[PDB]
Scaffold this active site. Structure first.
Site, PDB file in Angstrom:
ATOM      1  N   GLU A  17      72.716 103.151   9.426  1.00 37.72           N
ATOM      2  CA  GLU A  17      72.568 104.531   8.973  1.00 37.72           C
ATOM      3  C   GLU A  17      73.248 104.745   7.635  1.00 37.72           C
ATOM      4  O   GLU A  17      74.391 105.211   7.583  1.00 37.72           O
ATOM      5  CB  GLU A  17      73.023 105.534  10.040  1.00 37.72           C
ATOM      6  N   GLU A  75      64.723 102.822  15.644  1.00 40.59           N
ATOM      7  CA  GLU A  75      65.268 103.350  16.904  1.00 40.59           C
ATOM      8  C   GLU A  75      64.795 104.764  17.183  1.00 40.59           C
ATOM      9  O   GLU A  75      65.467 105.738  16.849  1.00 40.59           O
ATOM     10  CB  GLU A  75      66.802 103.253  16.974  1.00 40.59           C
TER      11      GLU A  75
END
Length: 292
Positions: free
Chosen positions: A135, A233
């Site tokens: 991230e 994801e």
């Protein structure tokens, strides 16, 4: 070599090995990686496995920032299980938050980690992809994100000249979508998008309309930049009831694969947000049906 578009087509729908190697220490969250997981993933129909890895506690905190050999050994073992069963296999840095806490101070350590990963896996099949960082967005500026991507890519390219690299293309939430304009001039890139809300339930009719809009904008971005898209994801939120949850898995998969996106479902191995039971070796077959 195989180009990113061919790779994304081959990747199709896959799964994360969540809460395992990206835990602080393997096995401290969900059950450690076992070879049979991959036998089951294959029998299930998955075409890729994302393997999150937190390098932090297996890497020296001080110079020269060596990764324990035994951990590199262990990640290679798991990678080799995945690759030999025909999976497109993704490894990354995941939960290595220390780098966002002090970019200037920690960037060298991060560089050396990737220097070592790249070196170790240099001869691996084209099917092993490098995802620079889970991230990239958050407590870190755009300039620093772009800086990170450039230098980690360059480090990777020294030993891996054509290996496809996954970088953050942007993110989405209920209110907006952000996409990167500055994309490195390199022919072997995949762009990835995750849910992210800077100001931090699901499965409603409105939530679906939100996601199609996001997916359509990402598609335009994909087309215009000539970069294929990977949702590494999805389905990370918690759900109102069973029927919403199943519908949501079904919806995401349809929408993604229609737009030509590659996918890895989030599976944390907890019976929370799990599809594969690592103890009984069974799958939630209704969710699998929804995914294929």
């Amino acid at each position: 070599a195989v180009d990113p578009f061919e790779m994304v087509r081959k990747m199709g729908m896959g799964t994360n090995l969540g809460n395992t190697l990206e835990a602080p220490y393997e096995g401290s969250w969900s059950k450690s990686a076992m070879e049979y997981y991959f036998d089951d993933f294959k029998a299930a129909g998955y075409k890729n496995v994302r393997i999150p890895v937190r390098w932090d506690n297996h890497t020296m905190r001080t110079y020269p920032y060596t990764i324990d050999k035994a951990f590199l050994d262990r990640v290679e073992q798991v990678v080799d299980w995945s690759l030999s069963r025909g999976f497109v296999t993704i490894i990354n840095s995941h939960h290595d938050d220390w780098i966002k806490e002090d970019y200037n101070g920690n960037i060298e350590r991060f560089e050396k980690i990737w220097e070592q990963i790249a070196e170790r896996f240099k001869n691996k099949s084209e099917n092993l992809l490098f995802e620079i960082m889970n991230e990239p967005f958050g407590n870190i500026t755009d300039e620093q994100i772009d800086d990170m991507n450039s230098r980690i890519l360059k480090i990777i390219r020294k030993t891996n000249p054509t290996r496809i690299v996954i970088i953050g293309g942007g993110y989405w939430n209920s209110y907006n979508t952000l996409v990167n304009i500055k994309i490195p001039d390199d022919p072997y890139l995949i762009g990835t998008f995750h849910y992210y809300d800077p100001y931090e339930t699901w499965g409603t009719q409105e939530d679906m309309d939100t996601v199609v809009r996001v997916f359509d904008f990402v598609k335009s971005w994909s087309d215009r930049n000539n970069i294929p898209v990977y949702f590494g994801e999805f389905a990370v939120m918690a759900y109102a009831d069973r029927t919403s949850r199943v519908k949501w898995y079904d919806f995401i998969s349809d929408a993604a694969l229609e737009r030509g996106f590659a996918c890895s479902v989030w599976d944390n191995g907890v019976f929370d947000m799990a599809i594969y039971n690592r103890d009984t070796r069974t799958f939630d077959t209704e969710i699998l049906n929804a995914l294929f």
